[PDB]
Amino acid sequence: VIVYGDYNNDGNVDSTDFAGLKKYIMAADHAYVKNLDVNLDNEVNAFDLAILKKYLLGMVSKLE
Protein backbone atom coordinates (compact mmCIF):
# COMPACT_ATOMS: atom_id res chain seq x y z
CA VAL A 1 0.00 0.00 0.00
CA ILE A 2 1.15 3.55 -0.83
CA VAL A 3 1.26 6.20 1.89
CA TYR A 4 1.02 9.48 -0.03
CA GLY A 5 3.14 12.28 1.40
CA ASP A 6 5.34 9.86 3.38
CA TYR A 7 8.73 11.29 2.41
CA ASN A 8 10.83 9.39 4.98
CA ASN A 9 8.89 6.11 4.62
CA ASP A 10 8.09 5.86 8.34
CA GLY A 11 4.36 5.26 7.75
CA ASN A 12 3.37 8.64 9.17
CA VAL A 13 2.67 11.90 7.34
CA ASP A 14 3.80 14.90 9.42
CA SER A 15 6.04 18.02 9.57
CA THR A 16 9.17 15.86 9.17
CA ASP A 17 7.97 14.90 5.67
CA PHE A 18 7.39 18.56 4.77
CA ALA A 19 10.95 19.55 5.82
CA GLY A 20 12.39 16.64 3.84
CA LEU A 21 10.41 17.27 0.65
CA LYS A 22 11.55 20.94 0.65
CA LYS A 23 15.22 19.91 0.63
CA TYR A 24 14.55 17.11 -1.86
CA ILE A 25 12.97 19.40 -4.43
CA MET A 26 16.03 21.68 -4.23
CA ALA A 27 18.29 18.81 -5.25
CA ALA A 28 18.34 19.31 -9.02
CA ASP A 29 18.90 15.56 -9.48
CA HIS A 30 16.01 14.42 -7.26
CA ALA A 31 14.32 11.27 -8.61
CA TYR A 32 10.65 10.65 -9.32
CA VAL A 33 8.94 8.99 -6.32
CA LYS A 34 5.37 7.74 -6.60
CA ASN A 35 4.34 8.54 -2.98
CA LEU A 36 5.49 12.17 -3.38
CA ASP A 37 3.63 12.79 -6.63
CA VAL A 38 0.35 13.58 -4.85
CA ASN A 39 -1.28 15.33 -7.86
CA LEU A 40 -0.40 12.49 -10.30
CA ASP A 41 1.35 14.68 -12.88
CA ASN A 42 4.49 12.51 -13.13
CA GLU A 43 6.67 15.13 -11.44
CA VAL A 44 7.78 15.83 -7.87
CA ASN A 45 7.90 19.61 -7.44
CA ALA A 46 6.49 22.66 -5.65
CA PHE A 47 2.84 21.71 -6.43
CA ASP A 48 3.27 18.51 -4.39
CA LEU A 49 4.88 20.49 -1.56
CA ALA A 50 1.98 22.96 -1.48
CA ILE A 51 -0.65 20.19 -1.32
CA LEU A 52 1.26 18.47 1.51
CA LYS A 53 1.40 21.77 3.48
CA LYS A 54 -2.34 22.36 2.93
CA TYR A 55 -2.99 18.86 4.27
CA LEU A 56 -0.78 19.36 7.34
CA LEU A 57 -2.59 22.69 8.02
CA GLY A 58 -6.02 21.01 7.80
CA MET A 59 -7.00 23.02 4.69
CA VAL A 60 -7.60 19.87 2.64
CA SER A 61 -8.82 16.48 3.89
CA LYS A 62 -7.08 14.47 1.15
CA LEU A 63 -3.68 14.45 -0.54
CA GLU A 64 -4.83 14.70 -4.16
Binding site: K22, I25, M26, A27, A28, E43, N45, A46, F47, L49, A50, I51, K53, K54, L57, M59
Partner: protein, 151 residues
Protein backbone atom coordinates in the same frame (compact mmCIF):
# COMPACT_ATOMS: atom_id res chain seq x y z
CA UNK B 1 4.35 30.03 -39.40
CA UNK B 2 3.21 29.96 -35.77
CA UNK B 3 0.24 28.47 -33.86
CA UNK B 4 -1.48 29.71 -30.71
CA UNK B 5 0.65 27.42 -28.49
CA UNK B 6 3.71 29.38 -29.72
CA UNK B 7 2.34 32.83 -28.81
CA UNK B 8 1.16 33.37 -25.25
CA UNK B 9 -0.71 36.57 -24.37
CA UNK B 10 -0.82 36.52 -20.57
CA UNK B 11 2.31 35.08 -18.94
CA UNK B 12 4.30 35.41 -15.75
CA UNK B 13 7.67 36.93 -16.70
CA UNK B 14 10.72 35.53 -14.88
CA UNK B 15 13.95 37.22 -15.95
CA UNK B 16 17.58 36.70 -15.02
CA UNK B 17 19.36 40.06 -15.19
CA UNK B 18 22.86 41.04 -16.24
CA UNK B 19 26.03 42.35 -14.61
CA UNK B 20 29.57 43.30 -15.52
CA UNK B 21 32.89 43.89 -13.81
CA UNK B 22 36.54 42.90 -13.71
CA UNK B 23 38.12 39.83 -12.07
CA UNK B 24 37.80 40.10 -8.27
CA UNK B 25 34.63 42.24 -8.31
CA UNK B 26 31.46 41.05 -6.64
CA UNK B 27 28.35 41.80 -8.71
CA UNK B 28 24.64 41.25 -8.15
CA UNK B 29 22.43 39.44 -10.67
CA UNK B 30 18.69 39.83 -9.93
CA UNK B 31 15.90 37.39 -10.81
CA UNK B 32 12.83 39.57 -11.48
CA UNK B 33 9.10 38.74 -11.70
CA UNK B 34 6.65 40.74 -13.81
CA UNK B 35 2.89 40.50 -14.44
CA UNK B 36 2.36 38.96 -10.99
CA UNK B 37 -1.10 40.42 -10.32
CA UNK B 38 -2.25 39.68 -13.89
CA UNK B 39 -1.39 35.99 -13.34
CA UNK B 40 -3.34 35.93 -10.03
CA UNK B 41 -0.26 36.18 -7.73
CA UNK B 42 2.47 33.63 -6.98
CA UNK B 43 1.91 31.15 -4.16
CA UNK B 44 4.69 28.67 -4.88
CA UNK B 45 7.56 28.04 -7.28
CA UNK B 46 10.72 26.04 -7.79
CA UNK B 47 13.31 26.37 -10.54
CA UNK B 48 17.04 26.02 -11.30
CA UNK B 49 19.70 28.27 -12.91
CA UNK B 50 22.94 27.09 -14.48
CA UNK B 51 26.20 29.04 -14.37
CA UNK B 52 29.87 28.52 -15.25
CA UNK B 53 31.69 27.85 -11.96
CA UNK B 54 35.09 28.23 -13.66
CA UNK B 55 34.22 31.91 -14.22
CA UNK B 56 31.86 32.82 -11.34
CA UNK B 57 31.80 32.04 -7.60
CA UNK B 58 28.41 32.14 -5.86
CA UNK B 59 28.91 34.29 -2.74
CA UNK B 60 25.26 34.47 -1.63
CA UNK B 61 21.70 34.04 -2.82
CA UNK B 62 19.07 36.08 -0.99
CA UNK B 63 15.34 36.61 -1.40
CA UNK B 64 14.27 39.90 -2.95
CA UNK B 65 11.84 42.40 -1.48
CA UNK B 66 8.68 40.94 -3.10
CA UNK B 67 9.05 37.82 -0.92
CA UNK B 68 7.24 38.08 2.42
CA UNK B 69 8.57 36.16 5.43
CA UNK B 70 11.49 34.80 3.39
CA UNK B 71 13.17 33.18 6.41
CA UNK B 72 10.28 30.68 6.40
CA UNK B 73 8.97 30.82 2.80
CA UNK B 74 12.14 31.02 0.67
CA UNK B 75 15.05 28.61 0.26
CA UNK B 76 18.07 28.56 -2.05
CA UNK B 77 21.24 26.50 -2.50
CA UNK B 78 24.06 26.17 -5.02
CA UNK B 79 25.96 23.03 -6.01
CA UNK B 80 28.10 22.07 -9.01
CA UNK B 81 27.08 25.02 -11.19
CA UNK B 82 23.35 24.87 -10.42
CA UNK B 83 21.47 27.33 -8.19
CA UNK B 84 18.15 26.00 -6.81
CA UNK B 85 15.23 28.25 -5.80
CA UNK B 86 12.14 27.34 -3.81
CA UNK B 87 9.29 29.53 -2.61
CA UNK B 88 6.10 28.53 -0.78
CA UNK B 89 3.78 30.71 1.25
CA UNK B 90 3.74 28.43 4.29
CA UNK B 91 0.48 30.12 5.42
CA UNK B 92 -0.96 29.28 1.96
CA UNK B 93 -3.14 32.41 1.83
CA UNK B 94 -1.54 35.26 3.81
CA UNK B 95 2.02 35.78 2.51
CA UNK B 96 1.65 35.51 -1.26
CA UNK B 97 3.85 37.24 -3.82
CA UNK B 98 1.56 40.05 -5.01
CA UNK B 99 3.92 42.67 -6.52
CA UNK B 100 6.30 42.85 -9.52
CA UNK B 101 9.98 43.22 -8.67
CA UNK B 102 13.04 41.30 -7.58
CA UNK B 103 12.38 37.71 -6.42
CA UNK B 104 16.04 36.95 -5.64
CA UNK B 105 19.50 38.56 -5.75
CA UNK B 106 22.54 36.41 -6.63
CA UNK B 107 25.95 37.72 -5.66
CA UNK B 108 28.74 36.39 -7.91
CA UNK B 109 32.47 37.01 -7.41
CA UNK B 110 34.22 37.33 -10.78
CA UNK B 111 37.16 35.05 -11.54
CA UNK B 112 40.16 35.69 -13.80
CA UNK B 113 39.92 35.69 -17.62
CA UNK B 114 42.49 36.39 -20.35
CA UNK B 115 40.03 38.27 -22.57
CA UNK B 116 36.65 40.00 -22.13
CA UNK B 117 34.14 37.18 -21.67
CA UNK B 118 30.35 36.98 -21.47
CA UNK B 119 29.02 33.95 -19.60
CA UNK B 120 25.31 32.96 -19.51
CA UNK B 121 23.13 32.30 -16.47
CA UNK B 122 20.41 30.02 -17.76
CA UNK B 123 17.18 28.22 -16.81
CA UNK B 124 17.58 24.44 -16.58
CA UNK B 125 15.98 21.29 -15.23
CA UNK B 126 12.33 22.15 -15.04
CA UNK B 127 10.25 23.23 -12.04
CA UNK B 128 6.83 24.62 -11.16
CA UNK B 129 5.02 27.96 -10.90
CA UNK B 130 1.79 28.15 -8.90
CA UNK B 131 -0.59 31.10 -8.54
CA UNK B 132 -2.32 32.43 -5.38
CA UNK B 133 -4.48 29.27 -5.27
CA UNK B 134 -1.36 27.07 -5.76
CA UNK B 135 -2.64 26.17 -9.24
CA UNK B 136 -0.34 25.86 -12.26
CA UNK B 137 0.30 29.20 -13.98
CA UNK B 138 -0.66 28.51 -17.62
CA UNK B 139 2.27 30.34 -19.19
CA UNK B 140 5.64 31.42 -17.81
CA UNK B 141 8.13 33.35 -19.95
CA UNK B 142 11.67 32.49 -18.80
CA UNK B 143 14.49 34.83 -19.98
CA UNK B 144 18.18 33.98 -19.44
CA UNK B 145 20.83 36.49 -18.25
CA UNK B 146 24.60 36.87 -18.17
CA UNK B 147 27.73 38.30 -16.56
CA UNK B 148 30.46 40.04 -18.55
CA UNK B 149 33.98 39.85 -17.11
CA UNK B 150 36.39 42.44 -18.54
CA UNK B 151 40.07 42.09 -17.49
Amino acid sequence: TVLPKDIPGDSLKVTVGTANGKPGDTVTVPVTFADVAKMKNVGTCNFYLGYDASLLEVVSVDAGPIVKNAAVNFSSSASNGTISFLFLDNTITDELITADGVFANIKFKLKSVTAKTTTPVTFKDGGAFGDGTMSKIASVTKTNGSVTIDP
